Structure formats: C-alpha cells, structure tokens
Amino acid sequence: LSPQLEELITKVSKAHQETFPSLCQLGKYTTNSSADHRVQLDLGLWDKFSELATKCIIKIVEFAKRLPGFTGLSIADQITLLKAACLDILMLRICTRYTPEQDTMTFSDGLTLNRTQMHNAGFGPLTDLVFAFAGQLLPLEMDDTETGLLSAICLICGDRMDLEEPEKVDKLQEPLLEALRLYARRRRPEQPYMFPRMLMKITDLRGISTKGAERAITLKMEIPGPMPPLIREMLE
Ligand SMILES: CCCCCCCCCCCCO[C@H]1O[C@H](CO)[C@@H](O[C@H]2O[C@H](CO)[C@@H](O)[C@H](O)[C@H]2O)[C@H](O)[C@H]1O
Ligand SMILES: CC1=C(/C=C/C(C)=C\C=C\C(C)=C\C(=O)O)C(C)(C)CCC1
Ligand SMILES: [Cl-]
C-alpha cells in the first residue's frame, strides 16, 4: 500500500464526479419530439443533442486537465490524446446513464431520450449497437471511481498516433492501471475478473467509437449546416 496511489484514486474519482453528474443526482425530464417512429433526423432533437455534446466535450477536457500529470504533457500531446479519446469517453458516459427498464439514456442536464429519440437525434443506424454496448456494460456494475479511472486510462494512452512523447504518456498511464486494479479488487474481492473485464471494455469502446465516427460522416449529409466546432475538432 502507498498513500500516493490512494490519493491518485480519490483525485481521479473526484475529477470524474465533478465533471459527470450521476444518473441518481439528475432531475430527469423528457421531450415528446419524434418519440414513436424512426426518422432520418429530427432537427430539433439534433439541436438539443449536439449542444449537450459540445458541453460534455468541454467537461471531458476539464476532467483531463485534472488528471495528475496531464498538463505536464506538451499541448500538442494533450490535444492529440483528447482528439483520440473524446468519442470513447462520450460513449462511456452516455451508456453509463442507461435505464434498461425504460430503454432510455440520460444526458448531463437530465434530458432522457428513449431509443427511437436517440436514433432521431443523430445516432441513426448506430443506435442499437450503442444500446447493446450499454446493455453489456451493466453487469460489470462499475461505480463512479471505476468509471473515472477507466475514462482516464482510455485517455492517457501511449499508442495514439502522432504523439510527441509516447513514453511519457506510457509512464502517466502506469499508476492509473495500478489504481484501478487495486480499487476494483478491494471493492469486490470475490469477483477477480472485474479488472481484466474493465480493460477489455476499452477495446469494445474503441470499436463502437470507430462506428460512431462512420455514423458522423453520413450524419453530415443530413444536417442543414456544419456540426458545432468542438464536435468537428473531435471528429475531423
Ligand atoms: C475533442 C477535441 C479537443 C480539442 C480541445 C478543445 C479544448 C477547449 C476546451 C475549452 C477550454 C476553455 O474553457 C473555458 O471556456 C469555455 C467557453 O466559454 C467554457 O465552456 C462552457 O462552460 C460551461 C460549463 O462547462 C458550459 O455550460 C458553456 O457551454 C460554456 O461556457 C468553460 O467553462 C471555460 O472553463
Ligand atoms: C457527439 C456526436 C456523436 C456521439 C455522441 C455520443 C456517443 C455521446 C454523447 C454523450 C453526451 C452528450 C452525454 C451527456 O450529456 O452526458 C455521434 C457519433 C452520434 C455523431 C454526432 C456527434
Ligand atoms: Cl483537421
């Protein structure tokens, strides 16, 4: 045991909780927009969804800047990491707020959309794969600390193309991996496969995000103007 590792766990947990409202703390609310049938795109829903996405991108940057050592990387490397991982983290975030009984996902302001509305907001042919990912995330029963640490591990990764100092990024990731294993095993000692299961979710997350990037291309043709600039920074 080391005090430094325990401090890292709590720092990351706090950074996550303070940039990602929990489903339980949110005042959920609904919309009646295009709620029953799948359409190509409901522009009202796209407007609301894309605005929320911009806000969450800013929150993910805020989260990143609170991760120990992140701001010690070159600005170029910080941007490179954020561009590489933002969509992964957005996916993890929305899927964490999945309510299976109601077949809904809840955004950071409490906006709660059913599957059809998620489709109509822009997810389109990606919707059911996203819900399937959320469904397969559930049994892991991850808590906020674990979700925070996993998000940090997804972001701080030395394999990203065009990194100036990949070995430096590698070194920053090391304690995050150690922290997640220590925490996961302590919390649920009778479920020792939880750590490796969590790590394998990273690969699943990358897979769904690649599909997300593909969806963005087709979505660009359906929208009446360009996507919001921070969304373009994430995708383009
Ligand atoms: C994925 C690609 C990544 C590319 C890197 C982009 C990093 C840019 C992040 C913005 C950094 C500056 O952030 C600073 O100004 C932003 C714009 O006024 C604010 O951004 C936002 O803040 C509020 C709460 O987060 C939001 O409800 C508002 O939409 C907006 O004002 C930040 O609260 C502020 O701390
Ligand atoms: C942004 C964006 C996309 C993905 C959004 C995802 C995957 C999650 C959004 C999460 C939010 C916005 C959570 C919150 O508010 O807590 C897709 C690929 C559809 C293409 C259009 C732009
Ligand atoms: Cl570009």
Numbering used by the authors: 182 to 417
Quoted from the paper:
Retinoic Acid Receptors (RARs) belong to the large family of nuclear receptor proteins (NRs). RARs are ligand-dependent transcription factors involved in a plethora of cellular phenomena from embryonic development and organogenesis to homeostasis of most adult tissues. Forming heterodimers with Retinoid X Receptors (RXRs), RARs regulate the expression of several target genes via binding specific retinoic acid response elements (RARE). RARs display a common NR modular organization with mainly two structured domains, a central DNA binding domain (DBD), a C-terminal ligand binding domain (LBD), and an unstructured N-terminal domain (NTD).
To investigate the consequences of S371 phosphorylation, we crystallized a hRARγ LBD mutant bound to 9cis RA and C12m in which Ser371 is substituted by a Glu residue, which mimics a phosphorylated residue (hRARγS371E LBD). The complex crystallized into the P41212 with one monomer per asymmetric unit. The complex structure was solved by molecular replacement and refined to 1.7Å. The electron density map showed the presence of the ligand buried into the ligand-binding pocket and an extra electron density around position 371 confirmed the mutation of the serine residue into a glutamic acid. The only notable difference between the two structures is the orientation of Arg387 in H10. Indeed, in RARγ wild-type R387 points towards the solvent, while in RARγS371E it forms a salt bridge with Asp340. This region is located over 40 Å from residue 371, and also shows a strong network of electrostatic interactions involving two salt bridges: one between R387 and D340 and another one between R341 and D269.
